[PDB]
Amino acid sequence: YYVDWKMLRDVKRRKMAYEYADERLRINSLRKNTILPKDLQEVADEEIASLPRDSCPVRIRNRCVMTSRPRGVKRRWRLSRIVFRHLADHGQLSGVQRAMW
Template structure:
């Protein structure tokens, strides 16, 4: 038995099929990667678009360049989600947890340095 399973937890492990909680979180992660990848280029082209000193033709070219970028490269499409439940609303940004999960973990003393208000 020891040769087959050298560590005791090998018999009772669960298979982790996906790294992300659901497809919404996976989609958001893809958007974050895309926004990070195109951030520098997008910043420069937007600066050209919004510069009123430049000729109108040049700004129109910059408009077309921005339109040619992938839609998911826009940082506005990124949504903060809870890392445990993928809930999009009521997320405590500092801990990246939804208010429901945050309260549950705080009530059960599972968050270091966090406790319920007592007076």
């Protein structure tokens, strides 16, 4: 079990987004070009609009991997602030010390 249903949803959006990556890339290339004819670009427009939009990149949300919390995650540890702190304060996180200066 992933910890939440929200997680299942986003796991799947990751798998989707890896699936169609190159269709996206390829099609969008024409679409982003000023050298090509506009005519090509309209059809291609309809084409990326075609492919399932649960497979689009921006629809992805980094979460805390243990705790699932949608905000507060620190990119490097893929952890929520609460969980991160929790670990770092038993000393279980290497090289992280409470900062004084």
